[PDB]
Amino acid sequence: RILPYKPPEEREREEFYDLWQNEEPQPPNPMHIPAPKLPPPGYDLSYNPPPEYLPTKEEREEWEKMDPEDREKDYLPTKYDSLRKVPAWGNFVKERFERCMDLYLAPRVR
Amino acid sequence: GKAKKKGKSGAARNYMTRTQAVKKLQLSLPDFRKLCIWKGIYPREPRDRRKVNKSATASTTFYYTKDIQYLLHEPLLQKFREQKALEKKISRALGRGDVSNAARLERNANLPEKTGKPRYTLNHIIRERYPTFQDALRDLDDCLSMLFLFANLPSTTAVPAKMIARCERLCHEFQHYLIVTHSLRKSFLSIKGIYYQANIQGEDILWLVPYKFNQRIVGDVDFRIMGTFVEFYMTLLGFVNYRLYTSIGLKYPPKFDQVKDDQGAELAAFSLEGLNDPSQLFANFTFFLSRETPRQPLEFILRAFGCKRIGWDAVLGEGAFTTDESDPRITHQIIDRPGRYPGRIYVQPQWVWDSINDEELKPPELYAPGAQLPPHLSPF
Amino acid sequence: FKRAEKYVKEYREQEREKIRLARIAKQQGSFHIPAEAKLVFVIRIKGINKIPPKPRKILQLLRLRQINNGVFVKVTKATAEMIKIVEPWVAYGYPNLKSVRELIYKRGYGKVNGQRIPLTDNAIIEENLGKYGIICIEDLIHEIFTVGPNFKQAANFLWPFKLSNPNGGGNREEHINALIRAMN
Amino acid sequence: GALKYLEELSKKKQSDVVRFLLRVRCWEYRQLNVIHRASRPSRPDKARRLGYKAKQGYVIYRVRVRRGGRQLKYQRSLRATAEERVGRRCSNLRVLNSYWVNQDSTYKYYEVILVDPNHKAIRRDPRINWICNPVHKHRECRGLTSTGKKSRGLNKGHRFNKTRAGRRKTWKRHNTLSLWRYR
Amino acid sequence: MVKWPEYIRLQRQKKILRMRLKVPPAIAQFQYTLDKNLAAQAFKLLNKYRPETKQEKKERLLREATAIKEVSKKPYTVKYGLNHVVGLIENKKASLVLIANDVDPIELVVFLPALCRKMGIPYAIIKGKARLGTLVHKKTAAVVAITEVRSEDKNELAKLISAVKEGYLEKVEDTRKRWGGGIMGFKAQKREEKRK
RNA sequence: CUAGUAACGGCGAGUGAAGCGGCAACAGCUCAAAUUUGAAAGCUGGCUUCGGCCCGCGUUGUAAUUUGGAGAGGAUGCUUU
RNA sequence: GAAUCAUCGAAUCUUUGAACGCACAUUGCGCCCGCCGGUAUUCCGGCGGGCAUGCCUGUUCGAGCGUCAUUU
Secondary structure (H helix, E strand, O other), X not given: OOOOOOOHHHHHHHXXXXXXXXXXXXXXXXXXXXXXXXXXXXXXXXXXXXXXXXXXXXXXXXXXXXXXXXOOOOOOOOOOOOHHHOXXXXXXXXXXXXXXXHHHOOOOOO | OOOOOOOOOOHHHHEEEHHHHHHHHOOOHHHHHHHHHHHOOXXXXXXOHHHHOOOOOOOOOEEEHHHHHHHHOOHHHHHHHHHHHHHHHHHHHHHHOOHHHHHHHHHHHOOHHHHOOOOOOOHHHHHHHOOOHHHHHHHHHHHHHHHHHHHHOOXXXXXXXXXXXXXXXXXHHHHHHHHHHOOEEEEEEOOOOEEEEEEEOOEEEEEEEOOOOOXXXXXXXXXXXXXXXXXXHHHHHHHHHHHHHHHHOOOOOOEOOHHHHHHOOOOOOOEOOOXXXXXXXXXXXXXXXXXXXXXXXXXXXXXXXXXXEEEOOOOOOOOOOOOOOOOOOOOEEEOOOOOOOOOOEEEOHHHHHHXXXXXXXXXXXXXXXXXXXXXXXXXX | OOOHHHHHHHHHHHHHHHHHHHHHHHOOOOOOOOOOOXXXXXXXXXXXXXXXXXXXXXXXXXXXXXXXXXXXXXXXXXXXXXXXXXXXXXXXXXXXXXXXHHHHHHOOEEEEOOEEEEOOOHHHHHHXXXXXXXXXXXXXXXXXXXXXXXXXXXXXXXXXXXXXXXXXXXXXXOHHHHHHHHHO | OHHHHHHXXXXXXXXXXXXXXXXXXXXXXXXXXXXXXXXXXXXXXXXXXXXXXXXXXXXXXXXXXXXXXXXXOOOOOHHHHHHHHHHOOOOOOEEEXXXXXXXXOOEEEEEEEEEOOOOHHHHHOOOOHHHHOHHHOOHHHOOOOHHHHHHOOOOOOHHHOOOOOOHHHHHHHHOOOOOOOOO | OOOOOHHHHHHHHHHHHHHHOOOOHHHHHHHOOOOHHHHHHHHHXXXXXXXXXXXXXXXXXXHHHHHHHOOOOOOOOOEEOHHHHHHHHHOOOOOEEEEEOOOOOXXXXXXXXXXXXXXXXXXXXXXXXXXXXXXXXXXXXXXXEEOOOOHHHHHHHHHHHHHHHHHHHOOOOOOOOOOOOOOOOHHHHHHHHHHO
């Protein structure tokens, strides 16, 4: 009835199943509105776009002069000759955190 | 003839404010917010906010009656009261000075810092939220994007190094599922990072893997809210990864060596046992990544397309082909610098991504080193 | 207000350390280690509040002042006796490739103009050093795993790593490589 | 043996240490309710001697009763009036016994031991499971406590002839005309 | 002005009455407890002789049971319980006795300082019956005692026995016999002058 | 049955027992006051595959031993489950 | 397997009444949870389970310079 003794260091040595085991189709209720997925990555998101997609240096300066969150696009394309010249994205985590409040703090309208 | 009030009848019965929902649930505001992430509760918009509440503002958020009633009957709400009393019991033995009673009560707590497995069990909530495996793959889009982003980020109080070590272990396990089934189709290079598209059961999954560098995290970010997102997605990851391995017949969880993982094998330590156009691309080819090229995004791609023999530098990893560059077995070396053996083709990692996207063997003469690269295109 | 409880303890720790420090100089400063040059990642842990003056000069020499910092050193017959003085406040051990590559990637800070900036661009690397044979972070990563002559500047470039405090996770040979994983 | 010391101290109750305690407690008990509750007995030696245990199902209640006459005298004792007022308050419990705790010029203060017949610790214990039986409902109302046995004259001897089995039963026996068949 | 709750006022008025009324020497000696240094040194020794809790006693019995399937000395713990402790001090088995100052029926400990002084065991009076229950692994302990310690710290108890004697016992010697009271404030002094 | 006796009384009216003896029926016990102190050994819950887990009560005392025509402790050797 | 049959271990059991959401001389007036029908996420009607007081044990929440510890 009773397990014998194991010393507590050996207890620290000591310390998956199918969710859809019986799966049936379920009709979705019309009130629940699913979240809209993110757009697919466009041509201009690439680190080496065609040179017709270059803006010149004036609106790069004009981009940095005006305040953030006043932009139609949070990005403009850049040119990089090699992947080692490409740095990490500066505001990636802030964008994903803004997606979090887009996912659970900003409402959906059907 | 009966008199009925406009305040008590109408949209006020249907929609309820956030403050009224919190007071009804008798929970704290972070507790109510966390339960909304797990259960998928959503504020939505009423048709007329004035009809819902006469004293109301557009900045205020409302809620539906039915999903609030689900939160009232949530077993997690019962589990929150049990965990709160248990957290009071942890400070009991600390206050008494009872070290042994503190050791066992934290062991009864099963706190996630020392375990890595999430604190609460949400198998029933995930089952209620996702009715089909296709919807799990649809939410795997943001799940894998969350997983690889927060696997690159360092450890904090909300996300300890144990949970990232579990995250990078399970992310490679899902990657090992992809390289067995050859599921990856499109790879995309971008300033934000590297995008990947793979097809599973007729469903496409997109995720973004930033470059392995130092990403600044400072500002106003809540580590608790990204922590509960990871905890929800980690539980969704484990049951999906168990389903996919049992679907293909490979055993789950796969075995691994801690010595190889500590020595830097990464993708090489994870050995997968079968029993408890993509393949034709580099069907019989040898690859050698140099020290500059990113090993982790490259190794994911060519193993997904079934290339057999790949090596890299000793300082880049462990458990690979021979490190020395004098071996003539290698055909294509991936170099990116600003030997020169005639038997070895010298080519750039940009050629790798273009050849995966086009699947037409783009010429290495055009992608020769020391020359300006052609503009690559987005497959989407 | 501070009690005579702490006064006697502080003077007892000071005479114990002075005897041990004067033990060390009077005896031969030789460690039971092979003469082959090796590499140490060394971490300051708070030993005692008061500090003696010979380690005062040498802890400023390792710029190891703040709580729970780390830095990479290379052992010589000199650097051993530097390590063989500062034992109670530091932990010394041989790193592994996974431990070192993560630590700079998760936390990489550089020193220019007396400023602690992150490691955001490899173009910043060439703007900082440039002409020392280094080409990116992985060049510095390889420089850590096998010591070259330019490691002296790479140690000087690299800021001390301000690691996070663990919640409970002299010489330790592999236990410090367990300590980096517990507290990074 | 701390309760032997308490027994000797309770005997000496006009002395300086105890009269101080009886003064400060009477002030506190006066400003509390009439039929308030006590978490622990104020006289643990008297509670122990009378049957109180530190077990779930045993509670203590404190009662203040007005002192004086009813020159008609109320034949019910002030302890019997105290016991009747707890039972009408704690109607789910059974009055075990009671004891004196304090005095004033206007009030007398008693502490009453109650036993819960519906707890499981009480029904399991054969030393107190007798009070679980339905004969012992409201013992204080029938004169079945130590106060009631005193006021009913339930002693033995020539001195207690009229009341040693109940005076109403004895008066019925002594006033009955017994007629037999073969008279 | 505002109205306080009834139990708040009653427990606050119990403060003023205790400090105003002059107290007989049996209860007045409980107002003189020991100092911060002697408490920490006493509890340093006493923590070393804590009893075993329900968890590590159940594991220790599980030790000897599974070994019997497949040699001990006398345990030394701090002694507690009133009738157990006063039985020990009546039999001169106790070395040091530590008494709480806040036993709600004070009579349960009011004979203890005289009984310890008659029998010859040195005693002390400490703040907190909750602090003694911490040592005991109970909620509250009215009194604790030490009978015998291991030979590792026979010297530590002897120095604590002396430190309790010359630091607490020969300082309250005159205040054992003398009454309490005499903490009258400015409002009480003006009221007494008006009454007289 | 004692006994309309003793005893009490505008000693008028009156009131009014009991021990003994013969029967009927019979049956004895539990605490508090003790230090288990070489080990709170006691008990309520609610979680369970039910086999045994935690929470609380409780040392200001829950079990065992003992209740003054007794008893405890040692020793002692038979007899009981 | 009849019965204005007997037995009786399973059910049903309207309003009241110690009478228990409020009122009562009206088949009325409120709140929490769920369901159904009729234009129906908003309107109406109906139905189901609940909502008295004193006290006991536990659970949980709160207050009190009542009160203890907290520089190793």
